């Protein structure tokens, strides 16, 4: 197997067709589904599977009380068959820790899991089912990483970490691994004030990541990373169509090199495909919560500080709950262009639905079409009254 290569570009995105949906919480009430969160999807040269941060307990067992808490020594990164539920009996632990990312370079997969206490965390980098590198904390304050698949070009897989304040400046680095080994790293540059939970996609030997400015931005920082030169850049989506959340209502004009003010010390992982006129943004429907989800065509959203939607597509009604969301693509599907894809973690339970003591989710993902398909809504589907 040769190392992959971001040879193609994104296809014309006109519609988002359904790709996967594991009714995990539905089935979970009468099956052995693990409690999870922070899911995402990735593909190897012959499969695409779901991934998530398990909580080391199923949904119906007594050990689910307290799963809101997102960091404990009982969490592992587990992977699983596309669209099936994460069941104890079918899941496959990948590494131990409560923050991750994973990409397949062509030859093998690289998985990274971060574990430890807030001030003393470490990231052990597995490459091919074996640990190979470790990196201890630098700012001793919740060393965290992507929470969604990473991208690799000819053997190099850029990946973004952050160690520090989640409500003030911090220290982020772009580590560049090859077969598990650190080829180099570098501190964040560009105009992005704060980076967190980067969603990266690849195409045309260049990686693009859209992240979360938890500190001051309602718009989102972007990082154009070059896999070969091993450099990178940052700024913000100029668009006044704000996509973070919480977020103030939509302005007429937007900020390009500085964060859009109004709401601070909060946000959600999100993503976007920036392809000139071929650009779509994803965002929650509520300006105050992670309820509903939508996709919108906003041409030149990255450069144009006035760009407004020209097409749309709902995914989750406002009344339904969303959560984290990100990108991923089958870099191995036969074709002349990479079909853009994404997933939205449908969050069920606490803090919103507090009739239960747990917090868990289910996934719904989609890929692009060149057809102008009709839209359908995709809710989690479970009835919280049944777990009482």
């Amino acid at each position: 197997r040769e190392f992959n290569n971001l040879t193609k570009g994104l296809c014309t995105i006109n519609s988002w067709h359904i790709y996967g949906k594991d009714n995990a919480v539905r089935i979970g009430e009468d099956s052995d589904v693990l409690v999870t969160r922070e899911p995402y999807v990735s593909c190897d040269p012959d499969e695409c599977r779901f991934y998530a941060l398990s909580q080391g307990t199923t949904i119906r067992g007594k050990h689910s009380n307290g799963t809101i808490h997102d960091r404990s020594q009982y969490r592992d990164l587990i992977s699983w068959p596309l669209s099936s539920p994460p069941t104890v009996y079918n899941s496959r632990v990948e590494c131990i820790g409560w923050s991750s990312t994973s990409c397949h370079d062509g030859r093998a997969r690289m998985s990274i899991c971060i574990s430890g206490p807030n001030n003393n965390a470490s990231a052990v980098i597995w490459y091919n089912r074996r640990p190979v590198t470790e990196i201890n904390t630098w700012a001793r304050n919740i060393l965290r990483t992507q929470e969604s698949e990473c991208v690799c070009q000819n053997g190099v897989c850029p990946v973004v970490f952050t160690d520090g304040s989640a409500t003030g400046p911090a220290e982020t680095r772009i580590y560049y691994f090859k077969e598990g080994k650190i080829l180099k790293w570098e501190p964040l540059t560009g105009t992005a004030k704060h980076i967190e939970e980067c969603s990266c996609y690849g195409e045309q030997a260049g990686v693009t990541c859209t992240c979360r400015d938890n500190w001051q931005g309602s718009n989102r920082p972007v990082i154009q990373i070059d896999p070969v030169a091993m450099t990178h850049t940052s700024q913000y989506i100029c668009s006044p169509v704000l996509t973070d959340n919480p977020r103030p209502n939509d302005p007429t004009v937007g900020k390009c090199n500085d964060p859009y003010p109004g709401n601070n010390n909060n946000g959600v992982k999100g993503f976007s495909y920036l392809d000139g006129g071929n650009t779509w943004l994803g965002r929650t429907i509520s300006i105050a919560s992670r309820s509903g989800y939508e996709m919108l065509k906003v041409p030149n959203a990255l450069t144009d500080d006035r760009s407004k939607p020209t097409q749309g597509q709902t995914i989750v009604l406002n009344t339904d709950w969303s959560g984290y969301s990100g990108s991923f693509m089958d870099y191995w599907a036969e074709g002349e262009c990479y079909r853009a894809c994404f997933y939205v973690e449908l969050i069920r339970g606490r803090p919103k639905e507090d009739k239960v003591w747990w917090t868990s989710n289910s996934i719904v993902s989609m890929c692009s079409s060149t057809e102008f398909l009709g839209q359908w809504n995709w809710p989690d589907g479970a009835k919280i009254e049944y777990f009482l």
């Epitope: 103030p248 209502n249 007429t252 509520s286 300006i287 309820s291 406002n318 009344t319 919103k352 639905e353």
Partner: antibody, heavy 122, light 108 residues
């Protein structure tokens, strides 16, 4: 005819708890965020929080994320607000209001109740 | 929070008069500003929303304008029934905030 009907005045002993009934009639209850507002001398008008009957979503004015707990009865079409641990300063006038943007947070408060005046005394 | 500056809590005028109330916001609220009239009993009514949109059944005489940080309500022919307090408010972000208010009175 949107009609947010609200009682005239509440009399409660200092340190107690209380519930603000805000019976809504005139549109699809389940479709509009319901807000609450306090009007007191000095501070003036203040937003307490928001209850969305459609799915129970709530958000509070950080300065009231203790004093108030929003809720609502979908059957009787009433929104509620229970204030915990009443003091002299709690004496003001509380209004429940409907959103112009329905589920959105724009379009101002298109419709207001008449206001409940809360009193704390002995 | 976004502070709503309403400078002038008292405005004398005479019936027939074209009065103008002004409002100020700490930051650029991008037009997400409304105006409320509270008649002397307690009735808080909405007149203009999103800077210039009149609400349903609101006298065609009431005006609203302003951009950036400064906005303003313009009452054309002051009628006795306009002698109330007007409050501007922003809904650009959460939390929502209101200005101090401006009590209209008669010059005699």
């Amino acid at each position: 005819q949107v009609q947010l009907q609200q009682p005239g005045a509440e009399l409660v002993k200092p340190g107690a708890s209380v519930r603000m009934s805000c019976k809504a009639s005139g549109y699809t209850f389940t479709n509009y965020n319901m807000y609450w507002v306090k009007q007191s001398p000095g501070q003036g008008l203040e937003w307490i929080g928001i209850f969305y009957p459609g799915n129970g979503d709530t958000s509070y004015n950080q300065k009231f994320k203790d004093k108030a707990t929003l809720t609502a009865d979908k059957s009787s079409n009433t929104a509620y607000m229970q204030l915990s641990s009443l003091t002299s300063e709690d004496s003001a006038v509380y209004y429940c209001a409907r959103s112009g943007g329905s589920y959105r947070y724009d379009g101002g408060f298109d419709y207001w109740g008449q206001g409940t005046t809360l009193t704390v005394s002995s | 929070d976004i502070q709503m500056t309403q400078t002038t809590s008292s405005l004398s005028a005479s019936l027939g008069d074209r009065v103008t109330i002004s409002c100020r916001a700490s930051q650029d609220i991008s037009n997400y500003l409304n105006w409320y009239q509270q008649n002397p009993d307690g009735t808080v009514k909405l007149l203009i929303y999103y800077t210039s949109n009149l609400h349903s059944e609101v006298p065609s005489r009431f005006s609203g304008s302003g951009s950036g940080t400064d906005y303003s309500l313009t009452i054309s022919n002051l009628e006795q029934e306009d002698i109330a307090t007007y409050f501007c408010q922003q809904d650009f972000t959460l939390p929502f905030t209101f200005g101090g208010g401006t009590k209209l009175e008669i010059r005699r």
